[PDB]
Amino acid sequence: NIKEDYFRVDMLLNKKGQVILYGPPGTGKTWIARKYVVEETNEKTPGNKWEFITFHQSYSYEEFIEGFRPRTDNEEKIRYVVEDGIFKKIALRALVKGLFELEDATIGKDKIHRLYILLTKKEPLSPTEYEEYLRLKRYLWELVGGLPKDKLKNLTPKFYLIIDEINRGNISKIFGELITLLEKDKRLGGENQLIVRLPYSGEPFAVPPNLYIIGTMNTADRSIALLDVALRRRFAFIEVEPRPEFLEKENLKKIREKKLKTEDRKRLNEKLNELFSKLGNDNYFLKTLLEKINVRITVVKDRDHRIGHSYFLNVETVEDLHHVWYYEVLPLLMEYFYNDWETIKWVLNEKGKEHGNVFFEKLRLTGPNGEEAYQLKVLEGDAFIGALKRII
Amino acid sequence: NIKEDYFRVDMLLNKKGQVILYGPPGTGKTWIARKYVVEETNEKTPGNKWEFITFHQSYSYEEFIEGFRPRTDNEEKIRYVVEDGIFKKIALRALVKGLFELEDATIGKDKIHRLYILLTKKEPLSPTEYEEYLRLKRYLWELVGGLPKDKLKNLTPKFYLIIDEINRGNISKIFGELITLLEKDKRLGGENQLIVRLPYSGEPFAVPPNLYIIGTMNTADRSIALLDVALRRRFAFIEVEPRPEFLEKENLKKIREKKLKTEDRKRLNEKLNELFSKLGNDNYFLKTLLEKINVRITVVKDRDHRIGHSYFLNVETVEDLHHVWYYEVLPLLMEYFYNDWETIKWVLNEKGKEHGNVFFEKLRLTGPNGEEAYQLKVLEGDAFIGALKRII
Amino acid sequence: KEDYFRVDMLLNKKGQVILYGPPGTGKTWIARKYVVEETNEKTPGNKWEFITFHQSYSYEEFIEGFRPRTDNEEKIRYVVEDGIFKKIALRALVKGLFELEDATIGKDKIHRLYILLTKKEPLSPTEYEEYLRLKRYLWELVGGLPKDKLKNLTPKFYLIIDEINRGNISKIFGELITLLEKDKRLGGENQLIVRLPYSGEPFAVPPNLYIIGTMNTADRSIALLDVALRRRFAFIEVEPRPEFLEKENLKKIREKKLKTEDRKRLNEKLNELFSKLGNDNYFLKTLLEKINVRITVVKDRDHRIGHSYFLNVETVEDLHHVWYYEVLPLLMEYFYNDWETIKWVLNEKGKEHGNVFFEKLRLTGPNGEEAYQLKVLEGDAFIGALKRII
Amino acid sequence: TTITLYEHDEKRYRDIAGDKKAIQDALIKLNKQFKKDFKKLDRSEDNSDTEDTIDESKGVVEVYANKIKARHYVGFAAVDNVFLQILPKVFKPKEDTWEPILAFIRMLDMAYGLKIKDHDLAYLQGRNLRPNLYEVFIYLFAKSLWSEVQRGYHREYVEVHREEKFLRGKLLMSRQIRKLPHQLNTFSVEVHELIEDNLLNRIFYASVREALRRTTWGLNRKLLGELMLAFDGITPIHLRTEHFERVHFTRLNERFRRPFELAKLLFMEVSGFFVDMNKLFERFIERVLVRNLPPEYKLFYQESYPFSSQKPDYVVRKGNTPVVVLDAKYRELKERIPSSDMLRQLYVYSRIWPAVIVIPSSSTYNQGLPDKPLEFEFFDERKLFIVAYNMDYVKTGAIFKADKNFRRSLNNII
């Protein structure tokens, strides 16, 4: 059941223009967005028809659309030519690649193809061809303003843009000219075509109807206090739930065999049969463990702080389940509950237990004002499985 | 279209000089600014008559009217020149286009035409003609010093600057000189002609009466709201409330067939008839749905966080209403009330309901300290309309 | 010793580790000794590289940046020079392509790149343009190689990063922080041949390059990091072990550094040390244990006292210097404007004006404060104040 | 352990929860902490005796050998996991201890000058939580912050003269002209960037971090957990009293006045605050009088000096001619007559101001209740007119029915 998630994105991406796959981390929001674009436009690498791009806290508008940047000129002293960002190198590219297929009697198809070469150039722009780039870009926005709205809706090559971790960067500052343009109506060819004049280069700029900006928002960090007006109306939000249905015996077998080889799937069958036999011969164990621990998360804390299902999807033995519970669940669980202990043991329903087979044991020396400090406790073997069999 | 939101913009912009269309997101603010200027200037693209820019937090004062911007010359790569921004390239454009039909510029009508060419020139200014541009600019402010105020009251073009999301930038810093020019009797030709002296170039500057500024701020966010009391006097705020009356049966057929004047009027009408026939033959359903949410949001949230009428405007079928509910406005409602479940159950008027045909099912597992949280339910079919008929 | 069987496991299922712990534990030394025991390079350089971070560290010195350069005593010529991470990721790529059977189509030119990438100060542009020509051949080659050949690269490279919490990790990695996931690296399932902003040449982390962090978490906790650091990395707590401070364990540790005749003098000095402390071989073990279990219950676990301070005690006067200039300054630093809780960490509460490490000042203040003052003890009176910490 | 007191009420050490030695250790720190911070709060006829009584471990609580007795200082304090709360004796009943909490905070709403909302308190009514004053003032801080952070984040503008690899804002020219060409590859700008971690956000990150560590509800732990995630990028600070003074309330962060004053009320060891029950009734009656006395304007704290100045709690005068002295007393007024200490002060306040004098007193089920009209007319053998007025308290509810009865009795008195 993953083709409906490649259809839930596909039905919203032609109706609103761009989506945001918001959900708790370790779910597959990066994997769903990357394996939808590769399945749609058959290009396994970034570059031509889609460009992977992540956000960070120090990411700025001048790296995204355009900004003044010092650039060397043929192994010599620097100049101060304005460089287009990662969006404007694909928003202009989605326009000039779509303008190949348009059969109009005003298109400079020799000139547009020259602009397409200078836009897909992986090397930086030398000043012998940077002025040829800015002159041809000036011809493009003199041509786009002359084309009617009837011939600027049917552009064939669907360009994509995987914005990874969209909420980590300051969303209203990055999308400077893109919180008035990213609607389906404010693109080129729509009913409300807007060609926005840019501050730095001074050339007009407008998003084409090819570009779809898929976002993968983690929401355990920099939470739902978003822009709530501009960066919330444009994006059609898709919740990617952490599904424990992929954590049964057959679903772990089906996932790890399709991507596998001939000799790998027989060994993955023997490893998973050894793992679930050590758990009590429960074929639905990791499903029931993740579903039970997700209900305790959404009751105490928010419903978007749940432990995802990319962690337990790559286990083959009890020892690998131990190294994913003590380094990708319990450090993640102590991150959400801000070093709290009396409520982090209720998630494991070990509230009235201490010093035994517990993941958080109480130290036997209280503080001066009666305070108590708990400590994480490593387990191994059947003691750890007995510590997992009472979470259910 | 021409009834209220057009005839109260045109009357107030001609009286005050500047209009801000403040209102919640999802309302026709960018649209009524775009429709009014295109229906006035008869130019469906930016450029000559009007310029559509948008503000952001990376927007500079130096890139708005005047600043030192390092250009790239041929033999001297790092050359620091003073470059006029977009407002000084529309204020000087509105001046020298309006000064084509005057009778005191009889010595330099060719010099005004030569200055109009240098401002309409989209090519970057070469330094051999930039001094020709600066000699004509300081000739212009010598010419308006000898022009009477009776002849600068009527300049026959009408230039516009639709700034969009005005409130996002630092409006006290972007409008550096413009916090004392932007008034109807403080432009050129007014009762107090003020020609202020710019910092960087040292050339005097005054906004012509030809210009108009249609801001469209957003007022859902509050940390970027326009509380500058000395700046709220310069503008003339027009509250565009989110009208649910654009969501009736006759109004959706009149709004969606006005723009799309193709032969699909028979297709839209039979689809909109089928959509409301699935809603119980209620011609005022979506009007009542947006009204009974915006009132229930006004009483608990602020009055400026209301759902607009741009979400439910593009609906066509119950499957399309299901897509615009669970993916655009229900993640929006979970953003307004983020883990405040007793409010968001009440906004949808499901306060006593906790099971069955409901959007938010109650979890059957309470917490340690008496807390309890809810869970979404993806509804479909006639049960979804049975969960929408409870709201109205 | 036993931590090297935990780092070696976690550096295969994640790809990077951060050895966080209280200061003076071994975090730098465990990271240094594990890499030297694995790649047999006693010095930095070829198979691994050591690097610290700081508050004003930059993207221009880590991955790629602009740097000035003279051209035979002429005007300043700017040239793009690769930083630390790109010079160790490209080095992990061109060394791994030696033992590949499919990369033998350019084995002469790839070997020319590896000699050029390990040497220092390329003096002329005639080998720099040769270097930029060979790097464009490298990314043209690995862009058309299958995933089976690029999954198992043989020689493992390491990057020991010191003070991973201090640097602005959202700036100095930039948009390359999503090249550290194991499925995001080169030769993985979802590989990324991403482009660098300065020189435009593509870049991708090979699966050899493991990032062994090191985190002094006395100031910044693990929850107070950046959000793209608690999920790309995997945290190993290097706990302060007091078991390295026995009578036989302190002798075995100091026996590795000294000679045979120094060892008998080391044996006689340690026999003179623990005889003055009361003939207790388990003394310095239970000193830090009775401190740390009283530290972790009044403060966080990440504010404990390590065991690198007491690893150089030879006489009581050396332990007098360690306890007064290296440990008790840490307890006064962690407990500011709070003299009662530090008096309970030493379990000397209620006892003042005697053999106490913080005597009570007689004065009270305008409204009334305690406002203690530390007391430098000496001789057997200091041991009489250290015996009752046990 | 949670211990609760009413004003001038006692609890037994044998019936009390926890340990006998643990509670008496908590109190001697609290009465000592009240000694050093006594002078910040104002009083009104308190008879405090600052030199002897407060420093003898009788500042807030009188800790005895067999019991624990409360003085007339109302509020709460949390010390050493022994949370003490002192409610007024007027709200004492005959969810059983949830009505006097919302009564006391509403009397702390109108008198003390707070601007909290009634729908903030009505959310908690009926959710069967454990009654605690620290759990609700943390909630009143956390809800009023999360309702003022959900709209806007308070990103305030600072200017930095920073060397940036890109060009943002105004380019500094005197720092770029004198730049050598070996270091020309970085612009030197002065950008007015908006920072999220301002001083008001460093405080609210620290005020939440010291609140989630010391909260006990299941509602405040969820609300402060969402507030701490919103403030994740902010570098933390150690809170002081210099930090709460260094910020100023301009127009661009005026909507953060309501969470900050509650963050200053709870944070600055000890936690919480205490106020005198005599002045809090003296302030609460002042809200009632000026609203209820249209004919004559009333000013509080007017002073006339005899011979040492004895000042009334409130005096009402229409212009200047009528002298109607109104001295607010928290006393129970037993046996339907004023005491020796009360009527002696009423005699002085009338004589130094032909002046009638009215004394307002509390009235509920717990306190002494007189009849509905003006209960006691008295003459002090000098043609005086002492009127004993009593204000009923519907302040436990949300409706002001007794204000109409207080106006009708005052209209017969005026």
Ligand SMILES: Nc1nc2c(ncn2[C@@H]2O[C@H](COP(=O)(O)OP(=O)(O)OP(O)(O)=S)[C@@H](O)[C@H]2O)c(=O)[nH]1
């Ligand atoms: N025909 C018609 N369309 C309308 C009307 N009001 C809104 N719309 C539609 O709403 C859509 C978007 O509304 P828009 O004005 O762009 O919101 P906005 O002001 O930009 O919202 P914000 O994020 O800046 S705060 C447009 O496609 C437009 O067609 C109206 O009154 N008539």
Ligand SMILES: Nc1nc2c(ncn2[C@@H]2O[C@H](COP(=O)(O)OP(=O)(O)O)[C@@H](O)[C@H]2O)c(=O)[nH]1
């Ligand atoms: N085969 C398969 N793998 C999945 C699926 N969902 C997630 N994964 C795994 O999840 C990993 C990616 O996790 P990621 O998207 O980066 O998590 P996040 O970005 O932090 O939310 C990959 O290694 C995938 O193998 C799925 O539906 N099918």
Ligand SMILES: Nc1nc2c(ncn2[C@@H]2O[C@H](COP(=O)(O)OP(=O)(O)O)[C@@H](O)[C@H]2O)c(=O)[nH]1
């Ligand atoms: N021989 C030996 N020395 C150790 C051990 N652990 C720590 N050290 C010493 O501790 C010092 C390193 O401390 P370091 O990790 O840099 O502390 P940091 O500042 O917190 O990083 C080295 O000089 C070592 O001599 C150990 O297990 N054996």
Ligand SMILES: [Mg+2]
């Ligand atoms: Mg991701």
Ligand SMILES: [Mg+2]
């Ligand atoms: Mg807009």
Ligand SMILES: [Mg+2]
């Ligand atoms: Mg170190």
